Amino acid sequence: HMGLRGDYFDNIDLTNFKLTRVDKTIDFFWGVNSPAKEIRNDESYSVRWTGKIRPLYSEEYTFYISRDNGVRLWIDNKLIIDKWDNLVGLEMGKIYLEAGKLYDIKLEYFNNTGNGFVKLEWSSASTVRSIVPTECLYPAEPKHYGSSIPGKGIGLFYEYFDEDNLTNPKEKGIDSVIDFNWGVGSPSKSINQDQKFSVRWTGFIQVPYDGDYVFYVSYDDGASLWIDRQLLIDKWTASEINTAKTEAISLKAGQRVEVMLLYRNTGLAGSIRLEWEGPGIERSVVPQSCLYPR
């Protein structure tokens, strides 16, 4: 097989996996739209490509990247282009390689609003500058993503607001999990891209195992968490990047815990994650399987 394995993530930071596929070459121009139907069309996404690269010659290779936005490129486990930033780069790194030998390649990429593109070229004394071609790329095996916790959940209900104070609603729906890092983007193109917006998630968490749980909310820059109509985390005006947690709560398998999670961005970047720890559950995003909208 030819190409590299692309793992596509719904956030700017290589979190919240939505799709793996084999891409024949790294040569993408996405405009302001998503790379794939599985990735929310909100202008905040990221990709990791992994596999092997086979040069034809025993020569110093130059790798060229065109990027919007950030890229990191490792060849033979050496980071040769380290450009994980919000600029637009039209980037080089050099490395000596041996003819016919297979080398590791890893390329990480993000889009943080606006246009998204990434193109990988190479040259050497005997290699005319070109897109790195498919016949020189071999895809990695898929890495598994996703929780082992079973259950019939489908997500929480969401309401997206154009103001930072839970007003001017623009969209509603279901979010599979609460694991978001939009950078300076909004949760949907229906929400103006001004870094001042808010979200209400509602529904129920159905508990998988008898024992004690702690909920963690990591936010930029305000959040409040209601559990069974008790306000357990009151950080609405915290205007900071931080994490907060509940006390331990004894819960039973099958118990339905009513949840209301309020979130806001008031400027610059925005992110929010709902995690838990529990019996047999290391601190981790509360999974879709345990989230219900009603």
Length of the chain: 294
Kindly state the smallest distance separating residue 102's Cβ from Ca ion, in Å. 33
Kindly state the smallest distance separating residue 70's Cβ from Ca ion, in Å. 9
Closest to Ca ion by CB, 124 vs 198, is: 198
- Segment near Ca ion (CB under 5 A); pick from 7-15, 18-26, 58-66, 147-155: 7-15
82 is in an annotated binding site: no
Q: Footprint of Ca ion on residues 139-178 (CB under 5 A)?
A: 162
Partnered with residue 198 across adjacent β-strands are 161, 264
Under the binding rule (CB under 5 A), the answer on residue 268 touching Ca ion is: yes
Kindly state the smallest distance separating residue 287's Cβ from Ca ion, in Å. 19
| HEC string for the chain | CCCEEEEEECCCCCCCEEEEEEECCCEEEEECCCCCCCCCCCCEEEEEEEEEECCCCCEEEEEEEEEECCEEEEECCEEEEEECCCCCECCEEEEEECCCCCEEEEEEEEEECCCEEEEEEEECCCCCCEECCHHHEEECCCCCCCCCCCCCCCCEEEEEECCCCCCCEEEEEEECCCEEEEECCCCCCCCCCCCCEEEEEEEEEECCCCEEEEEEEEEEEEEEEEECCEEEEEEEEEEEEEEEECCCEEECCCCEEEEEEEEEECCCCEEEEEEEEECCEEEEECCHHHEECC
221 is in an annotated binding site: yes
Under the binding rule (CB under 5 A), the answer on residue 179 touching Ca ion is: no
234 is in an annotated binding site: no
194 is in an annotated binding site: yes
Under the binding rule (CB under 5 A), the answer on residue 90 touching Ca ion is: no
220 is in an annotated binding site: yes
Residue closest to Ca ion, measured at CB: 44
Kindly state the smallest distance separating residue 25's Cβ from Ca ion, in Å. 21
42 is in an annotated binding site: yes
- Segment near Ca ion (CB under 5 A); pick from 4-12, 74-82, 198-206, 223-231: 4-12
Under the binding rule (CB under 5 A), the answer on residue 68 touching Ca ion is: yes
Phi–psi pair at 134, nearest 5 degrees: -60, -35
The number of residues that bind Ca ion (CB under 5 A) is 17
Kindly state the smallest distance separating residue 32's Cβ from Ca ion, in Å. 8
Are residues 221 and 264 in contact, defined by beta-carbon separation less than 8 angstroms? yes
Under the binding rule (CB under 5 A), the answer on residue 231 touching Ca ion is: no
Under the binding rule (CB under 5 A), the answer on residue 265 touching Ca ion is: yes
Residue from 25, 34, 44, 127 binding Ca ion (CB under 5 A): 44
Please enumerate in sequence order all residues whose Cβ is within 8 A of that of 37, keeping only pairs 6 or more positions apart, or say none.
Answer: none
Q: Which residues belong to the annotated binding site for Ca(2+)?
A: 10, 42, 44, 68-69, 111, 113, 115, 162, 194, 196, 220-221, 265, 267, 269
Q: Which residues belong to the annotated binding site?
A: 10, 42, 44, 68-69, 111, 113, 115, 162, 194, 196, 220-221, 265, 267, 269
Where on the chain is the footprint of Ca ion (CB under 5 A)? Answer: 10, 40, 42, 44, 68-69, 111, 114, 162, 192, 194, 196-197, 220-221, 265, 268
